[PDB]
Write a protein that binds this ligand. Structure first.
Ligand code: HEM
Ligand code: HEM
Ligand code: HEM
Ligand code: HEM
Lengths: 143, 141, 141, 146
């Protein structure tokens, strides 16, 4: 989970130009829409019967906030993802029973959303940086 | 398994992609190579440095291929037959890589056509690219 | 879906499985629940203790379904078309679980019929089970 | 990974009941047969044209021995896989460019071959134990850097 300073910057800058909370809610929503089975862990959130519905679901956007917040924490500690997410890991593993492959999916959703918001600013080099970050976060969560 | 709507979303989005085919192809490859270095080993004979002519010429062929899949959305298997044999028998590309290229294309699309790249559009394209990837690796099954 | 050599292997191996279908089905599920406990979440209404009449009965149904696919191998989807909705739209089973169950069944077969479980027979069953799995998850992709 | 002194005794006892070298050779062989794209990494091994040629290939067998030796190291250091495979992790990523998903596949081949060799001894519980081991090895090999 290393990052060239040049990259360390990109992630630091670009993550600033974006509205974190929107990213999380949109990333989660895309996850539920693109991979309908991930909905199984969210019967509570209510109506997830369709895309527009899912993307407009209050409980979905609200949870994205917490997911993006946690993601942000691991973003401030790209050197200790191990313990940073350790608590969550056992929660997603032993209590929620989420197959670790899914963490990787949400990470892809986050990457796609960032490209959706930052447009041309989310360049190849920039994506690589964030991918390494995303890859690291998912690794920690499953580990 | 593409609904009528999903199919129109692919056709609609394709119209726009085809007018920026060359750049969309090059950007997709750049994202792939930079974010997933393992993929570079398939092009040892290539000049993979920025603005490269080979990469640019190649990126154009890839998007054109995706276009053929759009034109033959009802029989992607038939359309991409020659390519699935090439990627499996000759190039022997690891199946996981198609998912990586698909992700990178989706990123390029979302960043280039933000208004059109809604959740539904995303789901439709992911499903479409999954069929294209499945067809290209069918020779391993 | 399968070539003649693969088909021949699936049928001859099935001839043996048939006489032990119930124990094979039960052994497969128990290997699955213990090696991949996450899968247990889909059977909260089940008494997952060994020798369970509920678990054994379910094991018999899974293997019976595999057998039905063997019987009409020229059209697997038509023989299992029914099970798709249940697993995909109703149960919403994560597709990764199908690889897990298939893997566990392969372990059971390898342990039960070592002489028959050659590399070739393994390749054929892996492809066959992958076909069965796509059909059951087809309401996804 | 973390295994009870029970699982550890089971893994230990069952492992002693197989020819490790054959297990490694047959697992690698099955990998090449069932997921043919993996052959791309072994062009120097010779004839891999058919399941028969692969399973009887001397280099494939010779290489399986190396794979299983490292695997055996892991069995002897379940409390520290990350460290044990750090060097192999670097080789496979930085030098060989092997997608880590394949580590999971070879791990599955080993588990299947263990079943093939042990029969009734490879109980559902024994598989579960070895499963944690193989998952641990795969993760250790995919762990970036050390
Ligand atoms: C980028 C990866 C992810 C991160 C950082 C993440 C983070 C979180 C956080 C911080 C919580 C709140 C728990 C707390 O601390 O109180 C949570 C809950 C949860 N997560 Fe995740 N998560 C991720 C991926 C996933 C995935 C892929 C799934 C499966 C579709 C998932 C399913 C859940 C569920 C079911 C809950 C509990 C929700 C509830 O009780 O309403 N998460 N996650
Ligand atoms: C949506 C997925 C893909 C499509 C539509 C696609 C399409 C193509 C096309 C049209 C060609 C040229 C065929 C010719 O000139 O005869 C090609 C070549 C090639 N592709 Fe792909 N490809 C895809 C994915 C991949 C992936 C994932 C890899 C591996 C990282 C890959 C590696 C190659 C290589 C090495 C060549 C040879 C090019 C040369 O020698 O110039 N392709 N592909
Ligand atoms: C080769 C793959 C599979 C086959 C052939 C298969 C077959 C079947 C069959 C025949 C039934 C009974 C249908 C009925 O009652 O009418 C069933 C039920 C069920 N299956 Fe599967 N299945 C497969 C994989 C899975 C997987 C991977 C999971 C999830 C870990 C799963 C979870 C369930 C559940 C929860 C039920 C409900 C049964 C009950 O309540 O009694 N199945 N399956
Ligand atoms: C259980 C997982 C694996 C283990 C423990 C493992 C272990 C090893 C070891 C000990 C070596 C020899 C290093 C040396 O002495 O120089 C090696 C080499 C190698 N491995 Fe792996 N490996 C694993 C999985 C894989 C996979 C999945 C692939 C790709 C399909 C792969 C491809 C290679 C290649 C190409 C070499 C070099 C062989 C040569 O140059 O002749 N390995 N591996």
């Amino acid at each position: 989970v290393h990052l060239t300073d040049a990259e360390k910057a990109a992630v630091s800058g670009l993550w600033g130009k974006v509205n974190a909370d929107e990213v999380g809610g949109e990333a989660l929503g895309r996850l539920l829409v693109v991979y309908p089975w991930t909905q199984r862990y969210f019967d509570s959130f209510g109506d997830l019967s369709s895309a527009s519905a899912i993307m407009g679901n209050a409980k979905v956007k609200a949870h994205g906030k917490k997911v993006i917040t946690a993601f942000n924490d691991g973003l401030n500690h790209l050197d200790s993802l191990k313990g940073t997410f350790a608590s969550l890991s056992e929660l997603h593993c032993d209590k929620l029973h989420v197959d670790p492959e899914n963490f990787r999916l949400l990470g892809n959703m986050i990457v796609i959303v960032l490209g959706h918001h930052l447009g041309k600013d989310f360049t190849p080099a920039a994506q690589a940086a964030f991918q390494k970050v995303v890859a690291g976060v998912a690794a920690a969560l499953a580990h | 398994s593409l609904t009528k709507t999903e199919r129109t979303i692919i056709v609609s989005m394709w119209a726009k992609i085809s007018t920026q085919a060359d750049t969309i192809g090059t950007e997709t490859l750049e994202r792939l190579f930079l974010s997933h270095p393992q993929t570079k080993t398939y092009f040892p004979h290539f000049d993979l440095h920025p603005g490269s002519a080979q990469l640019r010429a190649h990126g154009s062929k890839v998007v054109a291929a995706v276009g053929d899949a759009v034109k033959s959305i009802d029989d992607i298997g038939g359309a991409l037959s020659k390519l699935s044999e090439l990627h499996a028998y000759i190039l022997r590309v690891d199946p996981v890589n198609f998912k990586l290229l698909s992700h990178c294309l989706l990123v390029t699309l979302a960043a280039r056509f933000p208004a059109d790249f809604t959740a539904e559009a995303h789901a439709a394209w992911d499903k479409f690219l999954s069929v294209v990837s499945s067809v290209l690796t069918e020779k391993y099954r």
